[PDB]
Structure formats: C-alpha cells, structure tokens
Coordinates of C-alpha atoms (C1' of nucleotides) in Angstrom, one line a residue:
Chain A
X1 CA 223.5 48.5 11.3
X2 CA 222.0 45.1 11.3
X3 CA 218.8 44.2 13.3
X4 CA 216.4 41.3 13.6
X5 CA 213.5 40.7 11.2
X6 CA 215.0 42.8 8.4
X7 CA 215.7 41.8 4.9
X8 CA 219.3 41.7 3.5
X9 CA 220.6 41.1 0.0
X10 CA 223.4 38.4 -0.1
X11 CA 225.4 37.8 -3.2
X12 CA 224.7 34.8 -5.4
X13 CA 221.5 34.1 -3.4
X14 CA 219.4 37.3 -3.6
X15 CA 217.2 38.7 -0.9
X16 CA 217.1 36.9 2.4
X17 CA 215.5 37.3 5.9
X18 CA 217.5 37.2 9.2
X19 CA 216.2 35.0 12.0
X20 CA 218.4 35.7 15.1
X21 CA 221.7 36.8 16.2
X22 CA 224.1 34.0 17.3
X23 CA 226.8 34.3 19.9
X24 CA 229.0 31.2 19.1
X25 CA 232.5 31.5 20.5
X26 CA 235.6 30.6 18.5
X27 CA 238.9 30.5 20.3
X28 CA 237.4 32.3 23.3
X29 CA 236.1 35.2 21.2
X30 CA 232.4 36.0 21.2
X31 CA 231.8 36.9 17.6
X32 CA 228.4 38.5 16.7
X33 CA 227.1 35.9 14.3
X34 CA 223.8 36.6 12.5
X35 CA 221.8 33.9 10.7
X36 CA 219.7 34.4 7.6
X37 CA 217.9 32.3 5.0
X38 CA 216.3 32.3 1.6
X39 CA 213.3 30.3 0.2
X40 CA 215.2 29.1 -2.9
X41 CA 217.8 26.6 -1.8
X42 CA 216.8 25.9 1.9
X43 CA 220.1 27.0 3.4
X44 CA 221.1 28.9 6.5
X45 CA 223.9 31.5 6.4
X46 CA 225.8 32.7 9.5
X47 CA 227.9 35.7 9.1
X48 CA 229.7 37.7 11.8
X49 CA 229.0 41.5 11.9
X50 CA 232.7 42.4 11.9
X51 CA 233.5 41.0 8.5
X52 CA 230.0 41.5 7.0
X53 CA 231.1 44.4 4.8
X54 CA 234.1 42.4 3.7
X55 CA 232.2 39.4 2.5
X56 CA 229.9 41.6 0.6
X57 CA 226.5 41.9 2.3
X58 CA 224.3 44.8 1.4
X59 CA 221.0 46.2 2.8
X60 CA 217.8 47.1 0.9
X61 CA 218.1 50.1 -1.4
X62 CA 215.1 52.4 -1.2
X63 CA 213.7 54.6 -4.0
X64 CA 217.2 55.5 -5.3
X65 CA 217.7 52.0 -6.8
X66 CA 214.8 51.2 -9.0
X67 CA 215.0 54.4 -10.9
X68 CA 218.7 54.0 -11.6
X69 CA 218.5 50.4 -12.6
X70 CA 215.6 51.4 -15.0
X71 CA 217.5 54.3 -16.5
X72 CA 220.6 52.0 -17.1
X73 CA 218.2 49.4 -18.4
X74 CA 216.9 51.9 -20.9
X75 CA 220.3 53.3 -21.7
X76 CA 221.0 52.9 -25.5
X77 CA 224.4 52.6 -27.4
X78 CA 225.5 49.6 -25.5
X79 CA 228.1 47.6 -27.4
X80 CA 230.0 44.3 -26.9
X81 CA 233.2 42.9 -28.4
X82 CA 232.8 40.9 -31.7
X83 CA 234.3 37.8 -30.2
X84 CA 231.8 36.0 -27.9
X85 CA 234.5 34.7 -25.6
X86 CA 235.4 38.1 -24.2
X87 CA 231.8 39.0 -23.5
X88 CA 231.3 35.5 -22.0
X89 CA 234.3 36.1 -19.7
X90 CA 232.9 39.5 -18.8
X91 CA 229.4 38.7 -18.0
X92 CA 230.0 36.1 -15.1
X93 CA 232.5 38.5 -13.6
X94 CA 229.9 41.3 -13.6
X95 CA 227.5 38.8 -12.1
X96 CA 230.0 37.9 -9.3
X97 CA 230.6 41.6 -8.7
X98 CA 227.1 41.7 -7.2
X99 CA 226.3 45.3 -8.2
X100 CA 222.6 45.8 -9.1
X101 CA 223.4 48.2 -12.0
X102 CA 225.9 45.7 -13.5
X103 CA 223.5 42.8 -13.3
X104 CA 220.7 45.0 -14.7
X105 CA 223.0 45.9 -17.7
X106 CA 224.0 42.2 -18.2
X107 CA 220.4 41.0 -18.2
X108 CA 219.3 43.8 -20.5
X109 CA 222.0 43.3 -23.1
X110 CA 221.6 39.5 -22.9
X111 CA 217.8 39.7 -23.2
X112 CA 218.2 42.0 -26.2
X113 CA 220.7 39.5 -27.8
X114 CA 218.2 36.7 -27.2
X115 CA 215.4 38.7 -28.8
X116 CA 217.3 39.7 -31.9
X117 CA 218.6 36.3 -33.0
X118 CA 218.6 33.8 -30.1
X119 CA 221.8 32.7 -28.5
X120 CA 221.9 29.1 -27.3
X121 CA 220.4 26.7 -24.7
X122 CA 223.4 26.8 -22.5
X123 CA 223.3 30.5 -21.8
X124 CA 219.7 30.2 -20.9
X125 CA 220.7 28.7 -17.5
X126 CA 222.6 31.8 -16.5
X127 CA 220.0 34.3 -18.0
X128 CA 217.4 32.4 -15.9
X129 CA 219.6 32.5 -12.7
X130 CA 220.3 36.3 -13.2
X131 CA 216.7 37.1 -13.8
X132 CA 215.7 35.0 -10.7
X133 CA 218.3 36.8 -8.4
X134 CA 217.4 40.2 -9.8
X135 CA 213.6 39.7 -9.4
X136 CA 214.3 38.4 -5.9
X137 CA 216.4 41.5 -5.2
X138 CA 213.6 43.8 -6.5
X139 CA 210.8 41.8 -4.9
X140 CA 211.7 42.6 -1.2
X141 CA 212.9 46.1 -2.0
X142 CA 209.5 47.3 -3.1
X143 CA 207.7 44.8 -0.8
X144 CA 205.7 43.5 -3.7
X145 CA 204.5 40.0 -4.4
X146 CA 206.8 37.7 -6.4
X147 CA 204.3 37.2 -9.2
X148 CA 203.7 40.9 -9.3
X149 CA 207.5 41.4 -9.2
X150 CA 208.0 39.3 -12.3
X151 CA 204.9 40.9 -13.9
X152 CA 206.0 44.5 -13.4
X153 CA 209.3 43.9 -15.3
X154 CA 207.5 42.6 -18.4
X155 CA 206.4 46.0 -19.6
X156 CA 209.6 47.9 -18.9
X157 CA 212.4 45.9 -20.5
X158 CA 211.1 46.4 -24.1
Chain B
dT1 C1' 284.7 -19.8 -13.0
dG2 C1' 282.0 -22.6 -9.7
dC3 C1' 278.7 -21.9 -6.2
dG4 C1' 273.8 -21.8 -4.4
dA5 C1' 270.3 -18.7 -4.3
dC6 C1' 267.7 -15.1 -6.0
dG7 C1' 264.8 -14.1 -9.0
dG8 C1' 261.7 -13.9 -13.0
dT9 C1' 259.2 -16.4 -16.2
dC10 C1' 256.0 -19.7 -17.6
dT11 C1' 252.9 -23.4 -17.9
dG12 C1' 248.2 -26.1 -16.7
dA13 C1' 245.3 -26.6 -12.9
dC14 C1' 239.5 -34.3 -15.6
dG15 C1' 234.8 -33.9 -18.3
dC16 C1' 230.0 -32.3 -19.9
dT17 C1' 224.9 -29.9 -19.6
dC18 C1' 220.6 -28.5 -16.5
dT19 C1' 221.6 -23.8 -15.4
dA20 C1' 223.5 -18.9 -18.7
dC21 C1' 223.8 -11.5 -16.9
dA22 C1' 224.7 -7.6 -16.8
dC23 C1' 227.9 -3.7 -16.6
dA24 C1' 228.1 3.1 -13.5
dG25 C1' 232.1 10.5 -11.4
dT26 C1' 234.6 17.0 -14.5
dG27 C1' 233.6 23.5 -21.8
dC28 C1' 231.7 26.1 -25.9
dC29 C1' 230.4 28.5 -30.3
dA30 C1' 231.3 30.8 -34.8
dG31 C1' 232.6 30.3 -40.0
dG32 C1' 232.8 27.5 -43.9
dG33 C1' 232.3 23.2 -47.2
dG34 C1' 229.0 18.9 -49.2
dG35 C1' 225.1 16.4 -50.1
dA36 C1' 220.8 15.1 -48.8
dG37 C1' 216.2 16.5 -50.0
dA38 C1' 212.6 19.9 -53.0
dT39 C1' 211.9 22.8 -57.7
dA40 C1' 210.6 24.3 -62.5
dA41 C1' 212.2 23.7 -67.0
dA42 C1' 213.9 20.9 -71.0
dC43 C1' 215.1 17.7 -75.3
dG44 C1' 213.4 13.8 -77.0
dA45 C1' 210.0 10.1 -77.5
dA46 C1' 205.6 7.8 -78.1
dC47 C1' 201.2 8.5 -77.4
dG48 C1' 196.6 10.0 -79.2
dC49 C1' 193.4 12.4 -82.5
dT50 C1' 192.3 13.3 -87.2
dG51 C1' 188.7 10.3 -89.4
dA52 C1' 190.3 9.2 -94.2
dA53 C1' 190.7 5.3 -97.0
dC54 C1' 190.6 0.3 -98.9
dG55 C1' 187.7 -3.5 -99.1
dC56 C1' 184.2 -6.6 -97.7
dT57 C1' 179.4 -8.6 -97.3
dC58 C1' 175.6 -6.5 -98.0
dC59 C1' 170.1 -5.8 -98.5
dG60 C1' 168.6 -3.9 -102.2
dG61 C1' 165.7 -0.7 -105.4

DNA sequence: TGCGACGGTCTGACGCTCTACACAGTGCCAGGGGGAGATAAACGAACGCTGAACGCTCCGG
C-alpha cells in the first residue's frame, strides 16, 4: 500500500514525501513506522502502517480528482445560512474533515463571498491556509510546478 | 474568675544630596443610533454703480 519515495497527502499539512520506513520497537512490538515531511513547516511525521487509515492518511488521487473538484467548484445554487456563526462553525469542520471536495466547496464559496462584498481580515488567514493546502494537494497530484499550480487555478475559479 | 500563654495587631526602624528607571502569557461580527465633516440654497444686509446735482473758483470772450 505504502512504498518509499512516493507522495502522500496528510491532513492539515497537504502533500508530503516519505523518506524511509522506521522499525522502532515499542513494548517489544516492531511497528512499521514510516517517516514523511513537507517543505512548509520543517517537521517530520512518523506514522505506523497499521493505524495509517485510522489517522486519516490518503494517497494521490489520479485523473478522477481534478475533474470532480472542478465540477463541484463550478456547481451553482450553493447557499449558506443567514447567520454567519453557523457557517463559521461549519467551515472549519469541513476543513478538518480533510475531503478534497469539501475543501474545494469551502474555498469556492468563501472566495465568492470575498469577491461580492469582502468579509474581514480575520477570515483571510483561514482562506489563505485553505488555498495553500489545496494548491499543495493539487501540485503533487498533477506533478506540476507550484507557481504553475497556483497559476492554473486563476482562470478556473471565476 | 485567675492564670499564663497564645496569638494577633500595630508601630517605627537619625538626617540630607551627589546620584534618580523602568516596568512583560489565551474570540468575533452584524444591525442600528449620533455627530463630525461637506453641500447648495436662503433671507437679510450693505456694498457699489448710476452720474446727477449743488456750488465754487474760474479764465474768459
């Protein structure tokens, strides 16, 4: 399932590359740890392969992902509750869910809201974080350059 | 009630200048009411223009 040198998407950190497989022993049990890293925060993540699906790791989605996130990005008739508190409570939950379709919907609706009137400066931090993690997810999926990854999305979100 | 003792409470702890310094870890926005500043108009005032008009010295044919 998991090999060396491959790219894996980790929640709240985006795409990452695996360095090696670690065989550290805990209580006399040889767990199959794997170590991975990103270029954003300069951190190393060690996850055993047995509970990898439980913690929420996920591989690189092929050609079946960009088309579905584009068609849910272009999906009209999206509505939000009138009170901003319910939508505010929903969006970070959708971000923490880690689904690509959910984060694409959140960034599309939020970008539309910022375009129409302009929300605030506080929400700019989370829009920026979501755009960063989404462009990092799509950058290593299509194997494109990061500047090309952020450039290609500029003509499709309108 | 008398007893020590147990305890709290309270007080200051010589004088001045030469010197003499500053002070730090945990949310967020929408709807609505007031007064600050720009606007264009307004009622009244006095400010000018009209030279006219009164009166003077005036050079004068």
